[PDB]
Chain length 265, copies 4
């Protein structure tokens, strides 16, 4: 009996179902798929991309940027929620084709440079082309493009580098404080006494409190279902979206239930 | 219609068919699979590994090292023919589990650090966990472990970093100059006017001449079939093996035929 | 008037004054200089080095290891307090000459890979040869060599990656819990409203509390004066050494005074 | 007697003597110092910089770009002759402040990522802030910005990664084939039997022939004196400049004389 074949990272079809740009606020657009968020923020001096989704989405993102009037070279900066294959997948290829810089904290930088390999929980099961961060970000640091200020809020747990990004856009007239909060799932993770992540539970617990305190007129998440968006319904997409408070509290109830189950079995 | 799923790198079963250590000379053993070479050289001051095969072979290699009396921490150095998934696949994991250093030329180092992504010919189709080289090697440089001297001979073409490694072992008494020459295939490559590799044909042509001039009492290749080894027949494995001259000349005839076919269609 | 010349990183002579190995406990030795700590821990299966001091100390460290019976290849692992030139200076050269692996957290890893350049407070004024970390460590993770367990305790502030390392040695018979706590200085730092380190004050404040809670029968610090060691007096070197509590409290009083002075002027 | 202090990399004052932009052709300007070349090429879709000189020149270069109408964000690409402190010195800082990408061959990439440390001949004596290459270039590859095509010609010797860059500009009307050829010095190098560079002499010899064959209506070199430019005399700066043939032949005569002297003593 030979050694087993490598097994591809396959996802639900809706994670790979392309959509046209969906306007979130005056400068902010969802340009990823129906089930993976990729936010384009268009400024007077270039564009910012927050997340890119799966590795095979690079061309779709560039197509949607062009629909928005954004040439590849106009992308100045890539920001990330966390460096897993379904959110940072196409970053290497996007950098090559745009000249964009990547800004991320040290934890996200080292995982991205590994292509998601040697993941604390997934091992080498879910990888993607490696990419290097060009600017290292600290907790609370402000990154500014075209006058739009993006603030990082560290929320470790789902990954050590998990980050929420906040910025204030407008809706026609009035300001809208947008919060792009990272995932709070723990899919198949060993939570208690994890030798690769000894303070995992403490980090999640603090991250729930960080999410609750975010400036947050409008919450978005890497998976739209996590904050109750429906990208397929256009102008009704945000209607049932959760607050940052409700997102944190639902995530913590799920976490507490999984911890109790882990303690049981 | 959604975007396509990622597709795993699958190979012939014999590339993943484990074998027990096969002795090549007094200190040198084939410890990979029936169809992928991985050479262990055991010295008074630790072991050297030349190639590791596929990513999922790391545990098999460590098992065979232990059969040879070589504990994981006793592996001092990893050398590579070239940094493709089926030859350098398990290098990252081997480094983590042994403390070995990797020595390679600059071209092999940059490809390895990318996990084989953005390959000049394969793109992102065939990747593996990224790894960093700890020592950069120049053409003709000598690497010595436990008194055994390994000499690098650059033979670019199959990859820009393709390298032949030579060393002198013994067979009971008499010296045997071993040549571990890299692959000379060009699988699906565009050879002529390649914008990612403008001097590809010149490099292959020079590499044929480098292989012909190697010190070479015994030739081995990353794929045993390439030099006419049969690892499944034990002490008869090397009986029909090619000389370095015959390997180079057969590879150049194949190359010339493919170039003429490329020129035709 | 031409642009100014580059200016070397010069230190007090005692930071570069070599000393013979000074035994701290049964397996632990100070092998750096009179004014820079470099701890060698010798185990049944190889040695661990915690810090190396200045870049030009590599040969002195190897000389002292040899005096201890430790050949260069016997060094298995390098640990760091923080990645500044006077503590991590010779790490690159030590790795090349020993085959050791470096283990560090993500923050220390990214600063080390920059050679201390683009430092949040020093800019490019104080740099050293870059080095890569081979294993990324999480808060509370245990690294074990030869049965001796080293636990990391993150204490950000002096650098984002600042780390205390703890292990239990023996003194003849009885156990001694050693705490190698990092520096808590803020030399010339802007503490309040620092755009490169927005949560600097919160991190220092938490790090004082982390240091107070360390398992700590014997405290050592990267600069011996910081914990009131005198490496020049041999067996009396530790006599007046501070507890972890006193070190934290003295450091916090200094920090509070500097913050008040920063608030004033 | 203590260990010696670190010693700064100091150069002649004229290597740090700033100058205003000196026009070389319709799109090409010398914007470095009187004694260090840094070429700005201005295109319809952004600027290219070839070399930057010393680390402390970053601000001077940005000042000269602004004089040319080139904002920091308008710099798209940095190209290098070779990755030594006096030519690639400010690359890290320029990348941070412009968003430019660096393109270089694998040898130049690995040396740049080391900040020039562990240099084959200089060791750690001459270092600079490390920087990463964003695009790896092959021999003869064409890099295009704003329709202007830059071709790389490898000329190893001074460093393994030494590269000549060629492009065709215009002088008012007529085309001018510019050749920016790298240094061919061997300052204090051991040429014969160098274990860190065994094929050094063969590489230099081939590089003389590469330089002789360059498309070359106008030659420039990293040090203007090497090709007999005088940047201080404005429109007469290129009057006595050497051809590519004469540069190669003078460099080879110097090399041959140094080799004979090395063979003697
Ligand atoms: C298993 C996932 C997937 C993996 C991950 O990022 O952890 C990815 C590697 O495949 N992405 C994930 C994430 O939280 O970001 C996870 S969890 C899953 C995603 N949508 C679902 C959701 O959020 N609901 C509220 C139902 C659960
Ligand atoms: C297509 C391959 C495979 C790929 C490669 O390394 O290029 C790998 C990525 O899947 N390894 C390869 C190599 O030359 O190293 C190639 S060529 C193929 C391997 N054994 C065969 C062989 O060498 N014969 C003499 C029949 C041809
Ligand atoms: C300015 C330093 C020097 C610099 C640093 O590491 O920050 C280095 C870059 O030069 N190392 C330093 C450290 O805290 O680690 C600092 S502080 C200085 C060192 N010994 C002194 C001390 O600790 N006392 C209790 C008097 C103060
Ligand atoms: C010793 C140098 C200096 C060093 C180098 O790059 O090698 C640098 C590290 O300090 N740069 C150098 C180079 O060739 O690029 C060298 S050689 C020196 C520079 N101008 C002179 C010259 O080229 N003449 C024709 C007189 C000789
Ligand atoms: Zn995830
Ligand atoms: Zn996800
Ligand atoms: Zn291959
Ligand atoms: Zn192969
Ligand atoms: Zn410090
Ligand atoms: Zn210090
Ligand atoms: Zn040079
Ligand atoms: Zn120079």
């Amino acid at each position: 009996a030979p050694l087993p074949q490598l097994r591809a990272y396959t996802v639900d079809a809706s994670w790979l179902q392309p959509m046209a740009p969906l306007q979130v606020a005056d400068h902010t657009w969802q340009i990823g798929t129906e089930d993976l968020t990729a936010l384009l923020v268009q400024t007077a001096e270039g564009a910012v991309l927050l997340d890119g989704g799966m590795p095979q989405m690079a061309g779709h993102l560039l197509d949607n940027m062009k629909l928005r009037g954004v040439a590849p070279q106009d992308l100045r900066l890539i920001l990330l929620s966390h460096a897993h294959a379904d959110h940072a997948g196409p970053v290497a290829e996007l950098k090559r084709r745009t000249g964009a810089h990547v800004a991320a904290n040290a934890e996200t930088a080292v995982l991205l440079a590994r292509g998601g390999s040697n993941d604390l929980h997934f091992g080498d099961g879910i990888t993607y082309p490696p990419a290097s961060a060009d600017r290292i970000i600290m907790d609370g640091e402000v990154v500014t493009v075209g006058g739009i200020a993006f603030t990082a809020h560290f929320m470790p747990g789902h990954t050590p580098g998990s980050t929420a990004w906040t910025w204030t856009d407008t809706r026609d007239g009035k300001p809208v404080r947008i919060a792009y909060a990272d995932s709070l799932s723990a899919p198949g993770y060993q939570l208690k006494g994890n030798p690769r992540y000894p303070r995992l539970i403490e980090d999640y617990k603090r991250s729930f409190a960080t999410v609750r305190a975010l400036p947050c007129d409008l919450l978005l998440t890497p998976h739209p279902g996590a904050s109750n968006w429906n990208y397929a319904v256009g102008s009704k997409a945000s209607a049932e979206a959760l607050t940052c408070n409700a997102y944190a509290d639902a995530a913590e109830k799920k976490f507490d239930a999984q911890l109790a189950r882990e303690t049981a079995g």
